[PDB]
């Protein structure tokens, strides 16, 4: 079906505004922004919005690819036979959000409007973001938003309801997209007991322990937010096993998701032991690394064997591939495999850099540049997971 | 014939970039600009370009209106029936030129790179324009550029070639774009005579009495450079009379297009004889105004009774209109008539301010603000002229 001209025109308008806003933001950051001011909280807060916009772009690309490849994903998702959206709609929504995000970030730099406190722009931006979804009227996509709002209630409960493909899909893309949940806790502490709400200063050029009591671990306010998506997936898998009475896949998924529990708890334990300087800090570390390997060396084997269904024993013309592939060029498959292999090991370089010269506040600069790569890895994974599921559904 | 989605996307992208560039340019103009230099040369140089983009956008709106209203203009413009330029292409070209214009203006305002001091930017901009216009490569609407160049060559050498619709159409269009020629001549004079090229920027007030060599009428090139389009149209209609052998629509048209000769002659004479003392200048001024009265009144009786065929004795139900019309709303026609009268007599306010005020640099700024109004008058006039031409062609 042809798309309306107004839709493409809006997409182009929003895209152009986004590019020019990004360029002027970069120029303002390099030139006007002063060095002595701490800029950690700004990125620490806007990272969630940036990741959400990136994910919406990548979802638009994914659905474009699915429609062109011929995969009948509307039946897989059990959507209404309207497809509920074109890719232009995803692009337009994401461009709207990106324009709002850029405007708010520019306001947080230039401080345009007189004496308005600066600790309100991210609050207003996230308020608009949440209000765009929970809008009780019937405008601005009054169908897909309702579908997503009920699907986000089916997922976020877990054991009570049954299992659907949409639930599994959305719960998987909370594992990769965990930074959005991660910095909400930071925002909550920073606004509640770390800012100067009575005064007007959102930059705070000094440092302390209570000033930063939420970028560390300390209590469970950090690890539980880390493990919530893993908990949801674990419960969903266990419920599926209980309903279907199938041992192998669910009983291996249980461990495949509990290894994340073990890795997170051991890493947090090392952090809490080093918070004082205990001797066993040099012991528990020796576990973390290996308990990380058993993590990666699990999921990687799960990625190639069952997720994408590659390395098939009943192979064909293609080395280490399956007999039936829909995508045209095999270089896409090989590049995806190699980049998944590199990206799943995005912790080795982190350890390598966190073993050397002690640049002041060098901690989060590594994470800020590595967080966006997980979304790209998920974007790559989506194509092959959906195509394998389509092939399996068509086969039987 | 629906257009491809990529053209619409490009139109939207260019529109958004142009909008944001205009906003940031206005912000820089109000805030960044430091005033010790007369910025008027910049306005006098960039006014021609700005009017060019404005005219292109208005022409795009015009062709969209003709296509939607049902006025078959491709047949009467002797264009190829199976190959036309839709309004989207004109919008895209206008957006591209506006983006280049805004980039040049911003670079001139900020002076980012301190090697090419300031003067390279306008020369590069107009060089890009001319290189685009006469590019011999078979790209970027290679048919449209070649057709435009051929017809421009045909128009500029009028007394020899035969006369078609498009030739006198472009002659009429150029009759309302003498400001472009005046700006080009002023740029040439500025670069050749008074500019001290061996400098940087030129941050020296032009308040010194030695300026004005390229501002006045003096030797008498401004008058002819303004009056060329009148000469071309006069010779074209004379040749048309010679070919047609009769006088009813031809000799009166020649007189109408010749009145402006005496107009500009007396207008220039007043200015050049002001500095001599010459206690007879007002006498000339008298006649100047007097002559204006016929010219401003000669076109109006032509613009309504003959150009559009209005005020017909056989009107019928539609008073003060023609017998048959295509545009549905009569309010459009009435508003067009009133606006035509106002915009043709708009010279009265300009002369009143320039003769009753004591503010330096007044007449030129009033000319600047009234400049993007004659092109609007031409844009609206084209609708009814083309409709009347279509009805006349249908009649015979």
UniProtKB/Swiss-Prot annotation, chains A, B:
<dbReference type="GO" id="GO:0009615">
    <property type="term" value="P:response to virus"/>
</dbReference>
<feature type="binding site">
    <location>
        <position position="344"/>
    </location>
    <ligand>
        <name>phosphate</name>
    </ligand>
</feature>
<feature type="topological domain" description="Extracellular">
    <location>
        <begin position="34"/>
        <end position="38"/>
    </location>
</feature>
<dbReference type="GO" id="GO:0006817">
    <property type="term" value="P:phosphate ion transport"/>
</dbReference>
<dbReference type="GO" id="GO:0016036">
    <property type="term" value="P:cellular response to phosphate starvation"/>
</dbReference>
<feature type="site" description="Gating residue for phosphate transport">
    <location>
        <position position="347"/>
    </location>
</feature>
<feature type="binding site">
    <location>
        <position position="378"/>
    </location>
    <ligand>
        <name>phosphate</name>
    </ligand>
</feature>
<protein>
    <recommendedName>
        <fullName>Solute carrier family 53 member 1</fullName>
    </recommendedName>
</protein>
<feature type="topological domain" description="Extracellular">
    <location>
        <begin position="360"/>
        <end position="361"/>
    </location>
</feature>
<keyword id="KW-0812">Transmembrane</keyword>
<feature type="transmembrane region" description="Discontinuously helical; Name=5">
    <location>
        <begin position="163"/>
        <end position="196"/>
    </location>
</feature>
<keyword id="KW-1133">Transmembrane helix</keyword>
<keyword id="KW-1003">Cell membrane</keyword>
<dbReference type="GO" id="GO:0001618">
    <property type="term" value="F:virus receptor activity"/>
</dbReference>
<feature type="transmembrane region" description="Discontinuously helical; Name=6">
    <location>
        <begin position="204"/>
        <end position="245"/>
    </location>
</feature>
<feature type="binding site">
    <location>
        <position position="175"/>
    </location>
    <ligand>
        <name>phosphate</name>
    </ligand>
</feature>
<feature type="transmembrane region" description="Helical; Name=2">
    <location>
        <begin position="39"/>
        <end position="70"/>
    </location>
</feature>
<dbReference type="GO" id="GO:0000822">
    <property type="term" value="F:inositol hexakisphosphate binding"/>
</dbReference>
<feature type="domain" description="EXS">
    <location>
        <begin position="213"/>
        <end position="396"/>
    </location>
</feature>
<dbReference type="GO" id="GO:0030643">
    <property type="term" value="P:intracellular phosphate ion homeostasis"/>
</dbReference>
<feature type="transmembrane region" description="Helical; Name=7">
    <location>
        <begin position="247"/>
        <end position="277"/>
    </location>
</feature>
<feature type="transmembrane region" description="Helical; Name=4">
    <location>
        <begin position="118"/>
        <end position="139"/>
    </location>
</feature>
<comment type="similarity">
    <text>Belongs to the SYG1 (TC 2.A.94) family.</text>
</comment>
<feature type="topological domain" description="Extracellular">
    <location>
        <begin position="112"/>
        <end position="117"/>
    </location>
</feature>
<comment type="function">
    <text>Inorganic ion transporter that mediates phosphate ion export across plasma membrane. Plays a major role in phosphate homeostasis, preventing intracellular phosphate accumulation and possible calcium phosphate precipitation, ultimately preserving calcium signaling. Binds inositol hexakisphosphate (Ins6P) and similar inositol polyphosphates, such as 5-diphospho-inositol pentakisphosphate (5-InsP7), which are important intracellular signaling molecules involved in regulation of phosphate flux.</text>
</comment>
<feature type="binding site">
    <location>
        <position position="256"/>
    </location>
    <ligand>
        <name>phosphate</name>
    </ligand>
</feature>
<feature type="binding site">
    <location>
        <position position="257"/>
    </location>
    <ligand>
        <name>phosphate</name>
    </ligand>
</feature>
<feature type="intramembrane region" description="Helical">
    <location>
        <begin position="140"/>
        <end position="157"/>
    </location>
</feature>
<comment type="subunit">
    <text>Homodimer.</text>
</comment>
<keyword id="KW-0225">Disease variant</keyword>
<dbReference type="GO" id="GO:0005886">
    <property type="term" value="C:plasma membrane"/>
</dbReference>
<keyword id="KW-0472">Membrane</keyword>
<feature type="topological domain" description="Cytoplasmic">
    <location>
        <position position="246"/>
    </location>
</feature>
<feature type="binding site">
    <location>
        <position position="172"/>
    </location>
    <ligand>
        <name>phosphate</name>
    </ligand>
</feature>
<keyword id="KW-0597">Phosphoprotein</keyword>
<feature type="topological domain" description="Cytoplasmic">
    <location>
        <begin position="71"/>
        <end position="83"/>
    </location>
</feature>
<dbReference type="GO" id="GO:0005315">
    <property type="term" value="F:phosphate transmembrane transporter activity"/>
</dbReference>
<feature type="topological domain" description="Cytoplasmic">
    <location>
        <begin position="309"/>
        <end position="327"/>
    </location>
</feature>
<feature type="topological domain" description="Cytoplasmic">
    <location>
        <begin position="158"/>
        <end position="162"/>
    </location>
</feature>
<feature type="transmembrane region" description="Helical; Name=10">
    <location>
        <begin position="362"/>
        <end position="396"/>
    </location>
</feature>
<feature type="binding site">
    <location>
        <position position="377"/>
    </location>
    <ligand>
        <name>phosphate</name>
    </ligand>
</feature>
<dbReference type="GO" id="GO:0015562">
    <property type="term" value="F:efflux transmembrane transporter activity"/>
</dbReference>
């Amino acid at each position: 079906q042809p798309a309306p001209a107004w839709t493409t025109f809006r997409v182009g308008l929003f895209c152009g505004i986004f590019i020019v806003l990004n360029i002027t933001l970069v120029l303002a950051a390099v030139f006007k922004l002063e060095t002595d001011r701490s800029i950690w909280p700004l990125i620490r807060i806007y990272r969630g919005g940036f990741l959400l916009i990136e994910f919406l772009f990548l979802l638009g690309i994914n659905t474009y690819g699915w429609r062109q490849a011929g995969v009948n994903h509307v039946l897989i998702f059990e959507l209404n036979p309207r497809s509920n959206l074109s890719h232009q709609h995803l692009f337009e929504i994401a461009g709207f959000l990106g324009i709002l995000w850029c405007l708010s970030l520019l306001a947080c730099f230039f401080a345009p409007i007189s004496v308005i406190p600066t600790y309100v722009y991210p609050l207003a931006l996230y308020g608009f973001m949440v209000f765009f979804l929970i809008n009780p009227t019937k405008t601005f996509y009054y169908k897909s938003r309702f579908w997503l709002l009920k699907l986000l209630f089916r997922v976020f409960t877990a054991p009570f309801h049954k299992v659907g493909f949409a639930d599994f899909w959305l719960a998987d893309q909370l594992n990769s997209l965990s930074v959005i949940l991660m910095d909400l806790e930071y925002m909550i502490c920073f606004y509640s007991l770390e800012l100067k709400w009575d005064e007007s200063k959102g930059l705070l050029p000094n440092n302390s322990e209570e000033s930063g009591i939420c970028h560390k671990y300390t209590y469970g306010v950090r690890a539980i937010v880390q493990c919530i998506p893993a908990w949801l997936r674990f419960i969903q898998c266990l419920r599926r096993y209980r309903d279907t009475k199938r041992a192998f896949p669910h009983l291996v998924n249980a461990g495949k998701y509990s290894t994340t529990f073990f890795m997170v708890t051991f890493a947090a334990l090392y952090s809490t032991h080093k918070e004082r300087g205990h001797s066993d800090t040099m012991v528990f570390f020796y576990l973390w690394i290996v308990f990380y390997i058993i993590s990666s060396c699990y999921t990687l084997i799960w990625d190639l064997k069952m997720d994408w269904g590659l390395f098939d024993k009943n192979a064909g013309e293609n080395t280490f591939l399956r007999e039936e592939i829909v995508y045209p060029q095999k270089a896409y498959y090989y590049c995806a495999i190699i980049e998944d292999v590199i990206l799943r090991f995005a912790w080795t370089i982190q350890i390598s850099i966190t073993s050397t010269t002690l640049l002041p506040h060098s901690g989060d600069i590594i994470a800020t540049v590595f967080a966006p790569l997980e979304v790209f890895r998920r974007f790559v994974w989506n194509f092959f997971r959906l195509e394998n599921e389509h092939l399996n559904n068509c086969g039987e």
